Design a protein around this ligand. Structure first.
Ligand SMILES: Cc1cc2nc3c(=O)[nH]c(=O)nc-3n(C[C@H](O)[C@H](O)[C@H](O)COP(=O)(O)OP(=O)(O)OC[C@H]3O[C@@H](n4cnc5c(N)ncnc54)[C@H](O)[C@@H]3O)c2cc1C
Ligand SMILES: Cc1cc2nc3c(=O)[nH]c(=O)nc-3n(C[C@H](O)[C@H](O)[C@H](O)COP(=O)(O)OP(=O)(O)OC[C@H]3O[C@@H](n4cnc5c(N)ncnc54)[C@H](O)[C@@H]3O)c2cc1C
Lengths: 497, 500
């Protein structure tokens, strides 16, 4: 009856994962991926946003930034007097070489996994039919099931003159042929703070235009600590201010702001948000229902058309993360072809923001815990402190950023916080860690929290010394107490005695 | 009864267990004295308050390892990350940074005892009777009496008296962190965690480094993880002499000539014994008081109570518990609460995570493959694993030193990570051992150690959402078993996780 069991539109995190899992059950699977060029003409190989213009290149640029920070702050104190100069084009070559190998690895992975990969834009014709172009000619294939996994693309405001013509996005930043120099980042999203963070660490003059608050939706205390640290290390923030006009003035971009100020930059990067890439799919003619944001309505991965499914960044009401796209794709394949009833538990989706000091969490912010349980049923335990290694190095604020002689130190690099429900025996409902290696620390704690750990389980946990992570075994200061949660000790996360 | 005693608690030893118990006791309004005095090392090194971890253990070790990691990043990663660097190492500068940090910790602990209402006496104490301790103050020996006495004197490095020249010419972990002259070409004797950590950081800092290993690396630890560490250390330039120990150590000019048990001879600038540590209890007068010791010299106190019921012990001197700072600290705190606050709480010794801070680190909790197979039988065990590279490290294409190359193709360091779960099939693949070799292994292991203590199964790991990109996310996607015999090697470049 159908040429295929499953046709996947999109060769990113969710699409590649669903397609390969489906083919393991002996099913006939096709996958389409084609990269429409960015607003500045950037394009790239198979594997989607994470592989090409997301998690992978972002993590490599952050690693370069952490090396720059250790050479500047730490190396001499560790006995390694080091002079260095940064070559943007060399970091870009390293990123491009690594991503080019991943492109080929994913191409081979689909073929070996018995998935037919077609490098073409696909569009829906009917609930069982997909159209694409091959060598001039439009062809149709039929499938029992169709998965939409086309992800998102950066948003640039149409209502700001010159924004679309002169600005770059995350689609362009990792591959720029020339260093960005003096840079404006618009948006205090995780993408904007990560990007501003690594550009400032690499030595670029960096400004963030923040419409309101940093990391809207994340814990306020952790979000503000990140901004405090970024400011102390040289990122400038324009608070409550957005570009209204962008023009080329000689070799620079002249930006006019919503408060009447004007400033020239070499690079202007929009990191405001991402829109789901669905306008080309012909959703309205097929009867696939979309929300007011343009995302697909598919709370259990099933669209309004029962033969059409969706996972990843295009689906309303789920976090835009690689592991959530991957796991949704795999579990969908198992429900379709292996009689699984398994769904992701969306209450336990940990995440990490790779800012100059990183931020990992799972469960509820202080604000969401207070909203759900009430202030009286919540205890917040916290400690702000320095990594042992970093404390010994005596990191100092750049001279130009000091308010006075007293303002010499960087802020403490770590904040550990547990959010607990008193009526459930101080069950942990929120875990928060700001500091180095925050993703590495949060991963295992996120499983402990998912399994129902209480404050008592944390207090009875034997520490690994010396680590930052061991701090979670010895939290005692509460927000309610109003006592100082600052530790000026030098043994790091843990107690030497 | 208590009215006959000057103190509620007298603590002998101002290290991890002693300072923790003393301060916890004083929080309940009890009258507490603490003795600490540092007998100089076999090479005359001495230091301030705070014990082995603060002065000559975890703290200086972690700072030297951080310096080693910086050296490795500059050498292997910086240019690939776009940072063209020139660098040189000054041993004296690293030692100054350690000494400044440790001097501030000495001062901070001195302050913390005073503020915490603990009377600190800088003198050696010894037992007189079950309620009495003696020390010297300005020539004169004084006695103080106490309801309870805590012994927390820790250990000191062991050097074999039966090896001629060993005691005269060798240094130990007591000396290495403060040497006035950089160690140069160095022999480390012992493939203990202390020996491999010390050899690891000296090699990373650029010293010609040899380990003399009597038998196996990291005896008592998982064999597969221990062998992976030695493979990595060899690939980065540490030389291993297997089944060979020094039998003679002699001065020849400015160098130390070492004669080995196999008839080989080699000259070094520095010889460091990292064979083991003996409990420092010989001066406490334990025999006359009736405090029972094992044949190793450790105090018998499985619940912290010695054979004398007014005398307690915690930390490295107690038979049958791990020699770790957090186990000393937690034991001292819980002892103080059981004595003065009606607590019933003891450490659960089944879940004591640890990390070896080798050039690639190794964290674990629960059972090795060997102990799980010994306890449950091979047929009831599954081992799931993945060997792989950290994303950022894979992108850097780290290379072996030229002297270790065997061909055009032999360029790469080994993969830096190994993740392993040891599960019991009959208990629904309950996890009984967690193992991670790689960067940040202590940071990764801490949280997983709580999940394992709470009874996590393979299914709980498989249903855990990963944080991407991390090494730790690999624990959500383990599928290759040892039993399968299939390759557990991943040569992909997305790191711990799958991008699709
Ligand atoms: C700068 C940045 C950093 C990020 N960092 C992280 C991070 O550290 N951790 C993390 O977990 N997540 C991160 N993310 C998010 C992550 O990249 C996404 O959540 C994830 O890639 C979404 O997967 P997906 O399957 O929904 O789609 P994508 O991976 O976006 O793949 C969709 C694919 O479909 C293609 N396509 C679109 N329309 C069609 C069509 N009609 N026919 C054919 N092909 C089509 C696209 O070109 C693309 O290749 C980051 C994102 C960005 C932008
Ligand atoms: C090189 C090295 C690295 C280590 N790394 C780590 C690590 O990374 N993580 C970890 O958890 N553990 C580590 N350890 C172990 C850790 O240092 C110990 O487990 C811990 O310090 C033991 O605490 P304690 O209370 O038993 O005694 P100690 O901390 O050893 O303190 C005992 C104190 O008592 C004093 N003393 C002895 N006799 C007397 C007396 N009669 N009167 C008065 N004072 C006396 C001693 O001088 C000393 O100050 C390491 C050890 C070494 C040697």
């Amino acid at each position: 009856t159908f040429m295929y069991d499953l046709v996947v539109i999109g060769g990113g995190s969710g699409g590649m994962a669903a397609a390969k899992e489906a083919a393991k059950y002996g099913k006939k699977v096709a996958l389409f991926d084609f990269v429409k060029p960015s607003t500045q003409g950037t394009k790239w190989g198979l594997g989607g946003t994470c592989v090409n213009v997301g998690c992978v290149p972002k993590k490599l640029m952050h690693y370069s930034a952490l090396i720059a920070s250790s050479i500047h702050h730490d190396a001499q104190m560790s006995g390694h007097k080091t002079s260095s100069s940064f070559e943007w084009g060399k970091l870009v070559e390293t990123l491009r070489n690594h991503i080019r190998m991943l492109n080929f690895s994913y191409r081979t992975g689909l073929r070996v996994g018995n998935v037919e990969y077609i490098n073409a834009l696909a569009k829906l014709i009917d609930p069982h039919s997909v159209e694409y172009e091959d060598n001039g000619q439009k062809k149709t294939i039929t499938s029992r099931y169709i998965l939409l996994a086309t992800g998102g693309r950066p948003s640039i405001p149409e209502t700001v003159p010159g924004a679309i013509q002169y600005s770059i996005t995350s689609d362009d930043i990792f591959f720029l042929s020339k260093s960005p120099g003096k840079t404006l980042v618009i948006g205090a999203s995780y993408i904007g703070l990560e990007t501003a963070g690594f550009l400032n660490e690499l030595g670029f003059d960096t400004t963030v235009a923040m419409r309101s608050i940093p990391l809207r939706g994340f814990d306020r205390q952790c979000s503000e600590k990140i901004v405090e640290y970024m400011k102390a290390t040289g990122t400038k923030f324009l608070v409550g201010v957005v570009p209204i006009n962008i023009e080329k003035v000689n070799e620079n971009i002249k930006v006019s702001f919503s408060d009447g100020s004007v400033e020239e930059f070499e690079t202007v990067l929009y990191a405001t948000g991402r829109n789901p890439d669905v306008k080309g799919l012909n959703l309205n003619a097929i009867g696939v229902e979309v929300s007011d944001s343009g995302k697909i309505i598919a709370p259990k991965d099933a669209t309004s058309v029962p033969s059409i499914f969706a996972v990843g960044d295009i689906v309303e009401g789920r976090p835009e993360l690689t592991p959530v796209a991957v796991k949704a794709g795999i579990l969908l394949a198992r429900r379709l072809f292996a009689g699984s009833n398994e769904f992701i538990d969306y209450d336990f989706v940990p995440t990490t923001v790779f800012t100059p000091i990183e931020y990992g969490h799972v469960g509820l912010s202080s604000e969401a815990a207070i909203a759900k349980y009430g202030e009286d049923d919540i205890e917040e335990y916290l400690s702000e402190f320095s990594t042992l290694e970093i404390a010994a190095a005596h990191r100092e604020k750049p001279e130009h950023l000091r308010e006075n002689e007293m303002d010499f130190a960087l802020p403490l690099n770590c904040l550990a916080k547990l959010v607990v429900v008193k009526s459930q025996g101080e069950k942990v409902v929120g875990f928060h860690f700001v500091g180095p290696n925050a993703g590495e620390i949060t991963q295992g704690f996120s499983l402990a929290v998912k399994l129902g750990a209480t404050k008592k389980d944390f207090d009875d946990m034997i520490g690994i010394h010396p680590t930052d992570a061991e701090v979670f075994g010895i939290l005692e200061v509460t927000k309610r107490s109003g006592e100082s949660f600052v530790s000026s000790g030098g043994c790091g996360g843990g107690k030497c005695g």
